[PDB]
Amino acid sequence: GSNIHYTNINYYENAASNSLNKQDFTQDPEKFTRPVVDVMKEAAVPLK
Amino acid sequence: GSNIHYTNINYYENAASNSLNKQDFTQDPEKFTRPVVDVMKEAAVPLK
Amino acid sequence: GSNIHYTNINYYENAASNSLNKQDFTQDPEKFTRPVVDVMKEAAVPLK
Amino acid sequence: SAEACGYSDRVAQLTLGNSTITTQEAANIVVGYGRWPTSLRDTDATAVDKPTQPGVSAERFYTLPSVQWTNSFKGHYWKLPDALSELGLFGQNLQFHYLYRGGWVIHVQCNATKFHQGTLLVVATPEHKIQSAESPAFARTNPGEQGAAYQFPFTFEDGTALGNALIYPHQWVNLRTNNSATLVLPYVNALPMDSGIRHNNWTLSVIPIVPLEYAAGATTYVPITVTIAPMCTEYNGLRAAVTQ
Amino acid sequence: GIPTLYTPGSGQFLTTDDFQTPCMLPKFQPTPVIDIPGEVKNFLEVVQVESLVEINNVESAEGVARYRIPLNVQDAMDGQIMALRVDPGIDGPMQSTLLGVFTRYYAQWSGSLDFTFMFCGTFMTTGKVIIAYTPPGGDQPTNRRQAMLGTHVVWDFGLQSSITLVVPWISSGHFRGTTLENTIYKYRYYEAGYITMWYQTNMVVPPNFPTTASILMFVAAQPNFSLRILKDRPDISQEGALQ
Amino acid sequence: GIPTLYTPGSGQFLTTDDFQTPCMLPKFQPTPVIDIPGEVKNFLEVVQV
Amino acid sequence: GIPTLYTPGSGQFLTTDDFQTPCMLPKFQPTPVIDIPGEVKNFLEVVQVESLVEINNVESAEGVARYRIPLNVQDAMDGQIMALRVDPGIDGPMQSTLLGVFTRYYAQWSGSLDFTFMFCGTFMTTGKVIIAYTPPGGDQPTNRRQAMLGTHVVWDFGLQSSITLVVPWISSGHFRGTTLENTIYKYRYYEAGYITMWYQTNMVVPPNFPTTASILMFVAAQPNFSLRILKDRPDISQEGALQ
Amino acid sequence: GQVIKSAVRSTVENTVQSTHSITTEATPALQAAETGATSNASDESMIETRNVVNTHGVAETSLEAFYGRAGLVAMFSTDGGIYRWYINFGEYVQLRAKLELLTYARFDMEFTIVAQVVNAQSKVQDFNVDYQVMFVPPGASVPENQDSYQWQSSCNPSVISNTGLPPARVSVPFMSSANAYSFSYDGYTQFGDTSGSSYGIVPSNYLGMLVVRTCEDLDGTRLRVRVYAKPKHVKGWIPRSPRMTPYKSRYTGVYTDTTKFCANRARITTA
Amino acid sequence: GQVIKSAVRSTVENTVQSTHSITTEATPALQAAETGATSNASDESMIETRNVVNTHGVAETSLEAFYGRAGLVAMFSTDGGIYRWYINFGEYVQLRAKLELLTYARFDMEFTIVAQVVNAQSKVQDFNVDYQVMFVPPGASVPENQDSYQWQSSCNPSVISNTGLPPARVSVPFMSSANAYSFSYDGYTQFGDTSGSSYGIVPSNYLGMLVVRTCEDLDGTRLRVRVYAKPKHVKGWIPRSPRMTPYKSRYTGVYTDTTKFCANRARITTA
Numbered sequence A, B, C: 001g002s003n004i005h006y007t008n009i010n011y012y013e014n015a016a017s018n019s020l021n022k023q024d025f026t027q028d029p030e031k032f033t034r035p036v037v038d039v040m041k042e043a044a045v046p047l048k
Numbered sequence D: 001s002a003e004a005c006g007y008s009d010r011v012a013q014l015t016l017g018n019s020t021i022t023t024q025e026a027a028n029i030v031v032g033y034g035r036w037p038t039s040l041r042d043t044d045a046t047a048v049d050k051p052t053q054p055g056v057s058a059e060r061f062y063t064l065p066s067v068q069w070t071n072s073f074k075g076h077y078w079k080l081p082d083a084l085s086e087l088g089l090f091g092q093n094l095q096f097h098y099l100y101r102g103g104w105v106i107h108v109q110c111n112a113t114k115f116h117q118g119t120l121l122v123v124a125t126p127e128h129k130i131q132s133a134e135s136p137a138f139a140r141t142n143p144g145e146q147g148a149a150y151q152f153p154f155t156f157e158d159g160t161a162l163g164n165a166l167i168y169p170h171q172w173v174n175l176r177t178n179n180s181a182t183l184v185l186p187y188v189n190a191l192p193m194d195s196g197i198r199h200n201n202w203t204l205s206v207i208p209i210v211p212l213e214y215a216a217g218a219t220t221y222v223p224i225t226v227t228i229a230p231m232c233t234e235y236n237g238l239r240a241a242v243t244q
Numbered sequence E, G: 001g002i003p004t005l006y007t008p009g010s011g012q013f014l015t016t017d018d019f020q021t022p023c024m025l026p027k028f029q030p031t032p033v034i035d036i037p038g039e040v041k042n043f044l045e046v047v048q049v050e051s052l053v054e055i056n057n058v059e060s061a062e063g064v065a066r067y068r069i070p071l072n073v074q075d076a077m078d079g080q081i082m083a084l085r086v087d088p089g090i091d092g093p094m095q096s097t098l099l100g101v102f103t104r105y106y107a108q109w110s111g112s113l114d115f116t117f118m119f120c121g122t123f124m125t126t127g128k129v130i131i132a133y134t135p136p137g138g139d140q141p142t143n144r145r146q147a148m149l150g151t152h153v154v155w156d157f158g159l160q161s162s163i164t165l166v167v168p169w170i171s172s173g174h175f176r177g178t179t180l181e182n183t184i185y186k187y188r189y190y191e192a193g194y195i196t197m198w199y200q201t202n203m204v205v206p207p208n209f210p211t212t213a214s215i216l217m218f219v220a221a222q223p224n225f226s227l228r229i230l231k232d233r234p235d236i237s238q239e240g241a242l243q
Numbered sequence F: 001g002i003p004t005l006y007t008p009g010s011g012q013f014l015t016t017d018d019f020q021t022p023c024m025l026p027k028f029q030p031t032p033v034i035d036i037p038g039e040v041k042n043f044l045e046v047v048q049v
Numbered sequence H, I: 001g002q003v004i005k006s007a008v009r010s011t012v013e014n015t016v017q018s019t020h021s022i023t024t025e026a027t028p029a030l031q032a033a034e035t036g037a038t039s040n041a042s043d044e045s046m047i048e049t050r051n052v053v054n055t056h057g058v059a060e061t062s063l064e065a066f067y068g069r070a071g072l073v074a075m076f077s078t079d080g081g082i083y084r085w086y087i088n089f090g091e092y093v094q095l096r097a098k099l100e101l102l103t104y105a106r107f108d109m110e111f112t113i114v115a116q117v118v119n120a121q122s123k124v125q126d127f128n129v130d131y132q133v134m135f136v137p138p139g140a141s142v143p144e145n146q147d148s149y150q151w152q153s154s155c156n157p158s159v160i161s162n163t164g165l166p167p168a169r170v171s172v173p174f175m176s177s178a179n180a181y182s183f184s185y186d187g188y189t190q191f192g193d194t195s196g197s198s199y200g201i202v203p204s205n206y207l208g209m210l211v212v213r214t215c216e217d218l219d220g221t222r223l224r225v226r227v228y229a230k231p232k233h234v235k236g237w238i239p240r241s242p243r244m245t246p247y248k249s250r251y252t253g254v255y256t257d258t259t260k261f262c263a264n265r266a267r268i269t270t271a
């Protein structure tokens, strides 16, 4: 996959000149998948 | 033969971009040449 | 003449890729000029 | 002692489940690539459902129909797991699941007498393709428990040299020396598990390289028998039974 | 801009070059490496495995029969059974073996060779044969007495069905060319010698038994064997694109 | 001048390449990043909806 | 991409350049270096070895006879025996010597020279000769008296058959050109002088003995000798490809 | 588990001096090929040997050294300024035969593209033109013409170069959905079909196609293209019996039967 | 063992001041060439000398400095778009004569290839074309035509460049099966043959051939090629007597007999 021996040195003044970002993580999708006020546990019924 | 002063620095993000591997060893061929359960010493007879 | 600040770094795997050797000395030519068993001093006569 | 003097005893007993196989003229036991069958590691697995591991109901010896070593005999082969796809609970588990993984213990039997001569190469080949024909017949790529006769032994049915088949796990049944061959095979594939009705991981071949000959008047009817046992098996993706 | 001076070789495409280059899929993450039996790291592991020699390469032998060395009850003594140049990379009985194929993928070789033979007659069939290796210098030995002066082993048929004759590495140089092509390169210079087999006594059998039997011949590289300079295998070719 | 040897691939335009290049406006200073709800970092967050 | 600026010289092929370049066989492993006698690291080791001067290069002398300096019983005194320019790289008696060949592979030289002579007459043949080196400025000396004013050695024939005349390095500059080509370069400027030989007394022999004898002339570089600026040896040439 | 170890070496085995042996105990020469094991008789046991400190290396036969060089995998000319090449290594036999020496293998690859302009009579032209090579994964739309919209290549990777520049080159990672590429597959491409045409091919080995075009239309000439591939970072499993018959088809290993591999000689007793 | 040491120096020997000597003891000038030894008389012993701190170096005469530069070894034109050159350095005399100054030598080499297009009248053309140089080791199949399958070069090393790019260049290691190349061999190429044609040539010096082609067909023109070789990392043994007669053949050292090396002069007494 990705290298653990990558050399990141910027040759230019402006950050716009830099190469692509190398993070690429993902985050908990809750803000999109479960944007509700009241927590609804997986083991219980949703509405009661 | 091979150098003892080789510079190995990766310029790219993905390992697929890296140059060829530089190990090149060989291993005991037993798993192919003598894949038997019972050890058969060179000095004794094979079957008895 | 030759530099005292030369940078010698090998970029390739095989020594055959390296640049020319930088020693260039000469050695006592005795094995060619005086390959004799008995030493013959410059101050004495050769044969006696 | 056999292990003390550094040799291999000619007798052997193989016990799996409710089955036991014995031989008094063996020639050691081969363990393919030096590896015994093993379960799928959590770091190699991909299918998420809890697997089925039938145990003794499927990991036992199944004997297939015998084959006659005729004068014109060119050899015979069987595909695995194809050959057992309809035998016992191993077959049932193979049919009811999408995925299967397992090893094998193979025992080839062929006895004659000290008055007979002949030599059989017994080889287990991974991914052995039957490609001597432009369009291979299903009857030959998946011959079932009856197995199929060789038509092109010299080229190993795949365009390679028979003599180089020794690069695969094998033994020989040389009548003057032994009457059986035994091979333990681990699961081999480029995947952690696969379909047992669409892919055959191993092919067992029994090929006569030195024709069967004998003192005039001796028994001429000499059978070759194959007994195979699935070992360390597991299945995933349960559903209704499906065969190829 | 850092001052630079580009040199000869710039822009060339050397098939054996070894540079780093941009990846088509820079963020791609491959499937995990799983546990698969039989990993090989060097092909020397393969040439050390014995394979059959197509030793009986004569008009009368077709297919499988070409692997069998004919043996029969003699009515004369000291007769010859077979002969072969030991060179692993030349055209002949060795070319279709594992050792031969890989040797043919290289230009030079070195190391001892293992020639193993298995007798396949009946349990009652006996015999003693001598297998000899004749280092280079002259032609193959003409009779058993001459052959016997070189490296050899006397084989007695019995419970242990096989015997090994080690053709030790005996060469002027550390390596030998894999071909003996003469017309252009004069490589006959590298001939490694011959291996011959003779009846030491005779093949003997009981009444009504097969008076002919077979010997299978195997060959493999020893642990001190190696190859150098990769080259295209002369056996693989084509006359047009494949469809 | 440092001796160099240019290799195959030189001058090519690989759409997925990732090099640093001179900026058209080297001293430009972008507007600040403000607080906007719903930031997404990976589309896996979307296919899970 | 790191900003760079390629400069003049880029792409040129200078035969004496010294860069690192990709190897055709990156993983190749050469045969071991074994113990072989006579290793040489610098050709200065070779030019210090004495070799024969083709001194008698006249019409009447063919082949081997050209290495012999003629000596004979005189009936007059102070006569001359031979003469030669000492310059090691010019056309003449020196050009076919070891020293001459290598000097001809270079444009400049420096150092003292060793001229050794071996008398080859009978054990009973006696004589004394004077060998002189005349530093540049004029023409070769016309008589023994003039020659005797320069560097010289008086040689007495006896048990020790040879004598050495060292032509010391006496030059205005640290080096001299190896050619004296005048028409274009006016290199006659570098002439190093002459070496001449004269009868000091006379060659004397017993009754009925050979009244003529020979002297062999050797030349070699001294330990303070060196060469600069490699150039193609003018003697090696061809008019068409060789087959 | 694994009952046979695999210790690594960087040089071949040395030879140790040995002496004569007259005994009934040790019998190194006696073997039994029936066991399936290769002889274990050593040089030192068969003859009297001397000491040899053997420093011969083993590097050139490593998988990396054997496979680590470029080989031709595709060669074609555009037609109407375009060409569609399905990625597979069965067209040119040399590299194909090499890969088939292993059953399974993982490796990255370096692709190198060499292109030139040729006329109708197939004569090379000194003409620099821009060309585009686009990788179209299975499922993506393949351009029908030299100017179709797919050439926008906003997602598909593309490489644009010129016949006047050095050969184009890019690396690709190990892309199979499997954990290794398979160079021998005894199975079918799908369930419910047992026709011979779908036997012996593992679909996961096919990663798509390369479609090529000249960015603008050539006048009466065509673009000639050669694609070379070089395996890198090779890991392999299960050595196979080498191909011993000519290849006949690009997608199958079908062959013509033969009764011999090497040529015949007069007699078995004359070397 | 070695009874004569070989200490290394980086400068020539200094001159030390000396004075007169009138004695019966020391006689430096007296020598005996019969012993086979070169005179050992020093400057300081033959004349009165002064002190000279000589800093002259010895670098330019080292083996590396002498051999370390490129020289032409091959020059040819394609025929039918192809040319087969057997690797050997006997065609062009300059480099050949240099190598023959040593009996045995080990060295790596840097090969440089310069190619241009020329027409039928041998006039150079400004035409950029791709060319391929393939190294075919002995035993490998040599391509018969410009488009034969061997050009796939999946194992044979090949270098593909263009007449429009700088000269191609690659390094090669010390490849002989021997422990040193031999530039003088008093023996035969094989056992059982004593014909003159197989005398004086050591086969291990022949590593194969270079076959060249233009990747595509030229129209009426040919590819002109020059190959240069430059020894590197030189190690040499046993200096030899320099060639003193013209070369006549590419593979043998045969020559025309002569009665003199240098030209004659009027008399031995006139310099």
Ligand SMILES: CCCCCCCCCCCCCCCCCC(=O)O
Binding pocket: E024, H087, H088, H089, H090, H109, H111, H133, H134, H135, H157, H158, H159, H170, H172, H175, H181, H205, H206, H207, H210
């Ligand atoms: C955009 C630049 C284009 C460069 C080419 C990229 C090609 C990507 C595909 C790589 C897949 C390689 C798989 C090799 C296995 C095939 C084996 C077989 O033929 O059976």
Ligand SMILES: CCCCCCCCCCCCCCCCCC(=O)O
Binding pocket: G024, I087, I088, I089, I090, I109, I111, I133, I134, I135, I157, I158, I159, I170, I172, I175, I181, I205, I206, I207, I210
């Ligand atoms: C693929 C690129 C091609 C570059 C050329 C590679 C050539 C490899 C061969 C090198 C062998 C050099 C041996 C020199 C000794 C020959 C002496 C002789 O002629 O007798």
Ligand SMILES: N[C@@H](CCC(=O)N[C@@H](CS)C(=O)NCC(=O)O)C(=O)O
Binding pocket: H146, H147, H148, H149, H150, H151, H152
């Ligand atoms: N078919 C177009 C002409 C071709 C064209 O402009 N194609 C565009 C839009 S369909 C494109 O995507 N071109 C990609 C390219 O050529 O790079 C027309 O309507 O005349």
Ligand SMILES: N[C@@H](CCC(=O)N[C@@H](CS)C(=O)NCC(=O)O)C(=O)O
Binding pocket: E238, E239, E240, E241, H072, H075, H092, H226, I146, I147, I148, I149, I150, I151, I152
């Ligand atoms: N002879 C071929 C034409 C030439 C050709 O396509 N050759 C192929 C396969 S034989 C090749 O290997 N070419 C290598 C190359 O030219 O790079 C035909 O049948 O028309």
Ligand SMILES: [Cl-]
Binding pocket: E089, E090, E091, E179, E180, E181
């Ligand atoms: Cl041959």
Ligand SMILES: [Cl-]
Binding pocket: E090, E180, E181
């Ligand atoms: Cl031959």
Ligand SMILES: [Cl-]
Binding pocket: G089, G090, G091, G179, G180, G181
């Ligand atoms: Cl001159």
Ligand SMILES: [Cl-]
Binding pocket: G090, G180, G181
């Ligand atoms: Cl002059």
Ligand SMILES: [K+]
Binding pocket: A041, A042, A043, A044, A045, A046
């Ligand atoms: K819930």
Ligand SMILES: [K+]
Binding pocket: D053, D054, D055
């Ligand atoms: K259970």
Ligand SMILES: [K+]
Binding pocket: H011, H012, H013, H014, H053, H054, H055
């Ligand atoms: K070792």
Ligand SMILES: [K+]
Binding pocket: B041, B042, B043, B044, B045, B046, H027, H028, H029, H030, H031
């Ligand atoms: K044994």
Ligand SMILES: [K+]
Binding pocket: E048, E114, E220, E221, E222, H038, H039, H040, H041
């Ligand atoms: K062995």
Ligand SMILES: [K+]
Binding pocket: I011, I012, I013, I014, I053, I054, I055
């Ligand atoms: K000094």
Ligand SMILES: [K+]
Binding pocket: C041, C042, C043, C044, C045, C046, I027, I028, I029, I030, I031
């Ligand atoms: K002296």
Ligand SMILES: [K+]
Binding pocket: G048, G114, G220, G221, G222, I038, I039, I040, I041
């Ligand atoms: K001297």
